[PDB]
Design an enzyme around this catalytic site. Structure first.
Site, short mmCIF file in Angstrom:
data_model
loop_
_atom_site.label_atom_id
_atom_site.label_comp_id
_atom_site.label_asym_id
_atom_site.label_seq_id
_atom_site.Cartn_x
_atom_site.Cartn_y
_atom_site.Cartn_z
N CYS A 1 20.59 15.02 -49.73
CA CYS A 1 20.41 14.49 -51.09
C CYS A 1 18.93 14.13 -51.18
O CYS A 1 18.11 14.94 -50.65
CB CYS A 1 21.41 13.36 -51.34
SG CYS A 1 21.55 12.17 -49.97
N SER A 2 18.54 12.96 -51.70
CA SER A 2 17.11 12.59 -51.62
C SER A 2 16.79 12.02 -50.22
O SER A 2 15.85 12.54 -49.59
CB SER A 2 16.66 11.63 -52.72
OG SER A 2 15.22 11.64 -52.77
N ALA A 3 17.48 10.95 -49.80
CA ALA A 3 17.22 10.31 -48.47
C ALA A 3 18.06 10.95 -47.35
O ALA A 3 17.70 10.79 -46.17
CB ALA A 3 17.47 8.81 -48.56
N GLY A 4 19.17 11.61 -47.68
CA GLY A 4 20.07 12.19 -46.66
C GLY A 4 20.99 11.15 -46.01
O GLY A 4 21.40 11.38 -44.86
N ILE A 5 21.40 10.11 -46.74
CA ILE A 5 22.31 9.08 -46.18
C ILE A 5 23.42 8.71 -47.16
O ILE A 5 24.50 8.36 -46.65
CB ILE A 5 21.54 7.84 -45.66
CG1 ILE A 5 20.72 7.11 -46.73
CG2 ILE A 5 20.67 8.23 -44.50
CD1 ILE A 5 20.17 5.72 -46.28
N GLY A 6 23.18 8.74 -48.48
CA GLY A 6 24.12 8.22 -49.49
C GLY A 6 25.18 9.23 -49.87
O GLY A 6 26.29 9.25 -49.25
N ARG A 7 24.89 10.06 -50.88
CA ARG A 7 25.75 11.21 -51.27
C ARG A 7 26.07 12.09 -50.03
O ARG A 7 27.24 12.49 -49.85
CB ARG A 7 25.07 12.02 -52.37
CG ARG A 7 24.77 11.22 -53.62
CD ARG A 7 23.97 12.02 -54.64
NE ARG A 7 23.34 11.18 -55.64
CZ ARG A 7 22.55 11.64 -56.63
NH1 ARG A 7 22.26 12.94 -56.73
NH2 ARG A 7 22.04 10.78 -57.50
N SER A 8 25.08 12.39 -49.20
CA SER A 8 25.25 13.17 -47.96
C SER A 8 26.31 12.50 -47.07
O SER A 8 27.21 13.21 -46.49
CB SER A 8 23.91 13.32 -47.23
OG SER A 8 22.98 14.13 -47.95
N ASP B 1 22.91 10.11 -62.56
CA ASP B 1 21.63 9.42 -62.24
C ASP B 1 21.90 8.01 -61.69
O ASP B 1 21.19 7.66 -60.75
CB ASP B 1 20.71 9.39 -63.47
CG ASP B 1 19.73 10.56 -63.56
OD1 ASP B 1 19.88 11.53 -62.79
OD2 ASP B 1 18.78 10.47 -64.37
N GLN C 1 25.37 4.16 -49.04
CA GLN C 1 24.21 3.29 -49.41
C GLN C 1 24.65 2.06 -50.23
O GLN C 1 23.84 1.11 -50.31
CB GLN C 1 23.14 4.04 -50.23
CG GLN C 1 22.20 4.87 -49.37
CD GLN C 1 21.15 5.57 -50.21
OE1 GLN C 1 21.43 6.48 -51.00
NE2 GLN C 1 19.91 5.12 -50.07
#
Ligand SMILES: NS(=O)(=O)c1ccc(Cl)s1
Length: 282
Positions: A215-222, A181, A262
């Site tokens: 992921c949620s925004a598609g920039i960090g984990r992605s 989280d 991010q």
């Protein structure tokens, strides 16, 4: 400069924040005019995360062709990825339309539906064999075929049917379920294991359309997923693997989608995954 040495030098100096801001400062800026049209406001999860016009995925309909998704094309590595946001209640049908039109074999999901007590994306796939989903707006049917639940990830076999032509395809869903989280994993071992499971499936290979990653925004984990994959690929292709500059690969990828990686902790985690990945298949 060998990245393992660069890594220890940044760690001992504690300059992760200063490296990360240098990237933010040099990153590309291109227009996102289609994303900001008023007719598209409910197609965007976050007001500050938009696809560039030059690299956006277009839906094959005359009505409204817009989705929050970008094609990342890595010319030297010979890999393509589509990075997209977690689908919204009103974009679940757009999402599966894109998977169909682009001929993707795999979907990679790096978040849980609920995190920190809030919804991060819609429940966009069926949870029981006998309760299929129909997306009336895009005329598609989705059926759960098989489920394999492991400690760090789940793999699902799905059947996507174009109800217009009655063609069907097998889509693999790779769900990484243990990203914490807050912060990043302590060890990249389970993330690298997950990446090599996606590779072994054929989902990343040129006989299919590009893999869809979110992921949620598609920039960090992605961002972390495609940066690690591309860096490890170039380290095997090149005569000197020490020539692979992760910061230069990240700036190249940021020409196609804004904000990839991010935080300074995600940047350090990316170094780690590539550093360990290379040191395992060495
Ligand atoms: N039901 S099954 O023979 O395992 C099957 C595999 C792929 C599908 Cl799509 S349906």
């Amino acid at each position: 400069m060998e990245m393992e040495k660069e890594f220890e030098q940044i760690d001992k100096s504690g300059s992760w924040a200063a490296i990360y801001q240098d990237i933010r400062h040099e990153a590309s800026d291109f227009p996102s005019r289609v994303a900001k049209l008023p007719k598209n406001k409910n197609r965007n999860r976050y007001r500050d995360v938009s696809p560039f016009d030059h690299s956006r995925i277009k839906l094959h309909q005359e009505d409204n062709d817009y989705i929050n998704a970008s094609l990342i094309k890595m010319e030297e590595a010979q890999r393509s990825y589509i990075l997209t946001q977690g689908p919204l209640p009103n974009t679940v049908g757009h999402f599966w339309e894109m998977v169909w039109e682009q001929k993707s074999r795999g979907v990679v999901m790096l978040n849980r539906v609920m995190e920190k007590g809030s919804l991060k994306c819609a429940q966009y796939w069926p949870q029981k064999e006998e309760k299929e989903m129909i997306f009336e707006d895009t005329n598609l049917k989705l059926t759960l075929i098989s489920e394999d639940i492991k400690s760090y990830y789940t793999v699902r076999q799905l059947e996507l049917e174009n109800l217009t032509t009655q063609e069907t395809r097998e889509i693999l869903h790779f769900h990484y379920t243990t990203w914490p989280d807050f912060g990043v994993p302590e060890s990249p071992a389970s993330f690298l294991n997950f990446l090599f499971k996606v590779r072994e499936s054929g989902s990343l290979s040129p006989e299919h359309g590009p893999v869809v990653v979110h992921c949620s925004a598609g920039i960090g984990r992605s961002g972390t997923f495609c940066l690690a994959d591309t860096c490890l690929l170039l380290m095997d292709k090149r005569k000197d693997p020490s020539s692979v500059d992760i910061k230069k690969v990240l700036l190249e990828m940021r020409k196609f989608r804004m904000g990839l990686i991010q935080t300074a902790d995600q940047l350090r985690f990316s170094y780690l995954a590539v550093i360990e990945g290379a040191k395992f298949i060495m």
